[PDB]
């Protein structure tokens, strides 16, 4: 059995407190031999190495980042929560003379208040139905916390064939953007006439329904 | 000098082939640091392939990737390659390289920017574009239009989206690019642009173009922009001419329901032949452009229906049904195919008859117009010489067999005005008449007057002998005005005109200017047999009291004498004289015998 590093899922903070990221091993304890490293994964594909080597520093790293070894876990004490710290970190150690990584933890920094999400369903045109294909796009914008995806409920019955959800991305104006796709057939478009996009953002149910006769 | 790295972008490597990447580093001493390779999947975590020390050496690899490890590191080139052989289906990931300072704090410094590498057995296909326009119509200024071009399939996740207006201008405030999504085959990404109706209706940009820089080949995609409606169509239905029938026999089958005010191109045009919808037999012309350069966007569509001549002369009213945003616009025409060249110039004014004059005590003037080809411009107005306005009754008679029409104007005026020979003017303005026609009606000049002499003749004995029926006739002779009304009464009850006839007045022989007439009251023998009293009344202007009456019945000896003769005294004298004759004769005989003795 190899080394399996299990980190956290999602952590929330606020500008004014102190967030501490822990990393628990599986094979044994984390002492001064495991060179603890923390690599920040920025959304623009620009990695930056912050605390690399427990007590070892690095040029360009602010003084608000510090790394300690509380018992047997690598603690990352961050005094503050700025707008440029909301990213994904990793826990790199040393086992079997090689580097061991794992699933990163997405840190969420709740700063600006929430707003109202924009729901807009794009029905397929006539050029796509010629190839016996159909795809509906429901773009979801204006939202800091990406909410769970919802089933494309057609005629009051959710479907499972072709139900995927893309990963949120960091856009401009300190916001995020996402969308959804529903690959269907052209034979079901002429029979059905009820397509909605139910979006649940912290209890707020925003649904924009439409009909077939409303287009043409 | 800032330390920067150079890594390849999208690389299409077949799985039957090996992938060889690179890691260019500059700005520092390349002969004093190590080199690592971090593998990041799209959905998993970070990995570690292996390391290699360029100066000297002595390194190992991971337990999972012990083979397939290539790290040709060229000291002078200062670039680390990485050859991966035997590519499977789980090698589609992004690799990176950084700098490891072993002789300084053991940490990381700068990193890469991205290396797209998708190992797929398929080949390179052309990405197809699909416009996606929402069906939400802008109701006000707050509602925005959201459109976007969908990219169905593309190997290199690196794809841009450019939106140019009617001209080559790039949108600055519209920078939206959603990441790709692996849906089994190739990828699927889109890009929406949020604009405003204030910058669309005020410009000439009727459609946008979303282009894709896929290897330098840009594809144009005309994305239309929806508009508004609120416009009524101009339905114009034309009729075929009377001489257009192609062919010696009346044959023709062409019409043009023209309707141009239709903003939504899909317009439903149908034909209803006497309520029945026409299934087939009509041609619909394609939608073209009516006017160019103007501000509103108007089109033009003409529907042609092929019919026959026999179905047109049967008074078949067609209807060009036009559907525009649910509104149904109907239009009914007149399938009459008869020319109107018949129109003479001669209008007459008729005084009212004596019967109506006495019945209503209000004369009715007449403005009789004839030979009217058309009646839509007909207007009969009645007035006096002083110009006093008066109401005019307008009624149209049945059309004459030749096709000509007629009309009369009735105006109610007092009889005293007619007695005062008052003048009245009827003004008619017709399209067939070159000029308005002015005419005057008044009482004729002074003429000799003579009241009628009524005479009621009883049926002849010979007529009664056939025991079939009796015709009671009253002769009315010697009246100068021809306006005379003769009626008959039964027990004082009016008799319908279907039971008797009155000959029109005919000039009196031997006396010019005087008129006479008859009236025959044909009565069944059973009715006349009951001693009925039959009378005829004669209403006539010259009469001192305007009406008289004459009587006759079975008596036929209805002389008026009160009581003169027939008394019992006549019988008394007859008897006393018989006695007187007897006594005188006896006395004479006795005288003779006494002469004898």
């Amino acid at each position: 059995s190899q080394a399996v590093v299990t980190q956290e899922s999602a952590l929330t903070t606020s500008p004014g407190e102190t967030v501490t990221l822990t990393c628990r091993s599986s094979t044994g304890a984390v002492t001064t031999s495991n060179y603890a490293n923390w690599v920040q994964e920025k959304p623009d594909h620009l990695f930056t190495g912050l605390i690399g080597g427990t007590n070892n520093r690095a040029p360009g790293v602010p003084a608000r980042f510090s790394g300690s070894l509380i018992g047997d876990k690598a603690a990352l004490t961050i005094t503050g929560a700025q707008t440029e710290d909301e990213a994904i970190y990793f826990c790199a150690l040393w086992y079997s003379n090689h580097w061991v990584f794992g699933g990163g933890t997405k840190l969420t920094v709740l700063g600006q208040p929430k707003s109202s999400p924009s729901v807009t369903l794009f029905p397929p045109s006539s050029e796509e139905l010629e190839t016996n294909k159909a795809t509906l796009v429901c773009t979801i914008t204006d939202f800091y916390p990406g909410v769970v995806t919802v089933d494309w409920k057609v005629d009051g019955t959710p479907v499972t064939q072709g139900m995927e959800t893309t990963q949120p991305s960091k856009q401009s104006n300190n916001k995020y953007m996402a969308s959804s796709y529903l690959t269907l057939t052209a034979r079901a478009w002429e029979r059905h006439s009820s397509y909605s996009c139910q979006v649940t953002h912290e209890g707020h149910t925003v649904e924009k329904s439409l009909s077939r006769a409303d287009c043409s | 000098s800032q330390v920067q790295l150079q890594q390849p972008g999208a690389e299409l490597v077949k799985p039957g082939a090996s992938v060889k990447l690179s890691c260019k580093a500059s700005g520092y001493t390349f002969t004093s640091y190590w080199m690592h390779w971090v593998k990041q999947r799209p959905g998993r975590g970070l990995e570690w392939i292996g390391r290699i020390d360029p100066n000297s050496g002595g390194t190992k690899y991971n337990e999972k990737f012990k083979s397939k490890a290539t790290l040709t590191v060229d000291k002078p080139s200062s670039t680390a390659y990485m050859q991966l052989s035997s590519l499977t289906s789980e090698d589609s990931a992004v690799y990176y390289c950084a700098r490891y300072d072993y002789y300084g704090s053991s940490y990381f410094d700068y990193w890469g920017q991205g290396t797209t590498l998708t190992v797929s057995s398929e080949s390179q296909s052309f990405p197809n574009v699909f416009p996606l326009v929402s069906c939400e119509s802008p109701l006000s200024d707050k509602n925005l239009v959201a459109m976007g071009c969908l990219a169905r399939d593309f190997l290199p996740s690196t794809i841009s989206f450019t939106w140019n207006y009617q001209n080559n201008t790039e949108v600055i405030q519209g920078i939206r690019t959603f990441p790709t999504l692996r849906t089994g085959g190739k990828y699927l990404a889109t890009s929406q642009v949020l604009l405003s109706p204030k910058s669309i209706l005020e410009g000439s940009d009727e459609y946008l173009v979303c282009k894709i820089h896929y290897g330098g080949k840009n594809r144009d995609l005309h994305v239309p922009i929806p508009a508004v409606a609120e416009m009524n169509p101009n339905v114009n239905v034309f009729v075929p001419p009377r001489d257009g029938f192609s062919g010696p026999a009346p044959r023709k089958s062409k019409l043009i329901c023209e309707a141009t005010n239709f903003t939504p191109k899909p317009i439903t045009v149908s034909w209803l032949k006497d309520g029945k919808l026409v299934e087939s037999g009509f041609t619909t012309d394609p939608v073209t452009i009516e006017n160019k350069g103007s501000t509103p966007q108007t089109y033009k569509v003409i529907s042609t229906l092929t019919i026959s001549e026999i179905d047109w002369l049967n008074l078949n009213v067609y209807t060009c049904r036009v559907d525009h945003r649910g509104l149904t616009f109907l239009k009914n025409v007149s399938s009459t195919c008869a020319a109107s060249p018949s129109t003479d110039i001669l209008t007459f004014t008729i005084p009212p008859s004596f019967a109506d004059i006495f019945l209503s005590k209000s004369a009715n003037l007449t403005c009789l117009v004839s030979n009217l080809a058309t009646y839509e411009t007909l207007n009969i107005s009645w007035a006096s010489q002083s110009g006093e306005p008066l109401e005019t009754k307008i009624k149209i008679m049945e059309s004459h067999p030749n096709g000509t029409f007629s009309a009369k104007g009735v105006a109610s005026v007092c009889v005293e005005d007619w007695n005062n020979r008052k003048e009245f003017v009827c003004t008619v303005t017709h399209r067939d008449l070159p000029s308005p026609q002015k005419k005057f009606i008044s009482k004729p000049n002074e003429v000799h007057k003579h009241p009628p002499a009524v005479y009621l003749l009883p049926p002849a004995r010979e007529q009664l002998n056939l025991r079939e029926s009796a015709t009671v006739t009253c002769l009315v002779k010697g009246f100068s005005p021809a306006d005379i009304s003769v009626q008959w009464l039964q027990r004082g009850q009016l008799l319908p005109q279907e039971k008797y006839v009155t000959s029109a007045p005919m000039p009196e022989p031997g006396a010019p200017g005087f008129y006479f007439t008859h009236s025959i009251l044909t009565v069944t023998e059973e009715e006349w047999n009951s001693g009925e009293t039959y009378t005829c009344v004669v209403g006539h202007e010259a009469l001192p009291h305007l009406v008289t009456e004459r009587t006759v019945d079975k008596s036929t000896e209805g002389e008026v004498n009160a009581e003169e003769e027939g008394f019992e005294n006549l019988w008394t004298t007859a008897s006393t004289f018989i006695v007187l004759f007897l006594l005188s004769l006896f006395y004479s005989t006795t005288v003779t015998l006494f002469k004898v003795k």
Partner: protein, 143 residues
Amino acid sequence: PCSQIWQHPRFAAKKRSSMVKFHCYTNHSGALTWFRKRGSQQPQELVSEEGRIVQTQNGSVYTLTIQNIQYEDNGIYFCKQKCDSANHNVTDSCGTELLVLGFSTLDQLKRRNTLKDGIILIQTLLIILFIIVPIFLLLDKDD
């Protein structure tokens, strides 16, 4: 309040034993009495007889009909009514002055009158003659 009686052709020049229909149209309802007047004599009550005087009541209308009319029927005919309105306000009709016509063809009368004039001139002559006969005869008889 009891004076709305109607009537019919009044003069009614007729031949002996002829037919006309009388009535008593009124806007009231009460006791009725037919009356007959001849000349200047007083009003008298009429007596019904079948086939000579027909009396059918058509509701508010009192139909009458006189057959076998002779010269004695010449005069004035009208129908009375009784108005017991606490004032004895008795009203009557207006009249129907019936006349009987002589039939001399309006022409034989002249011939008859001329003939009687001839006969009474013959009276003058013959009576003078038969008054002068007795005296002139007894003068010769006595001589």
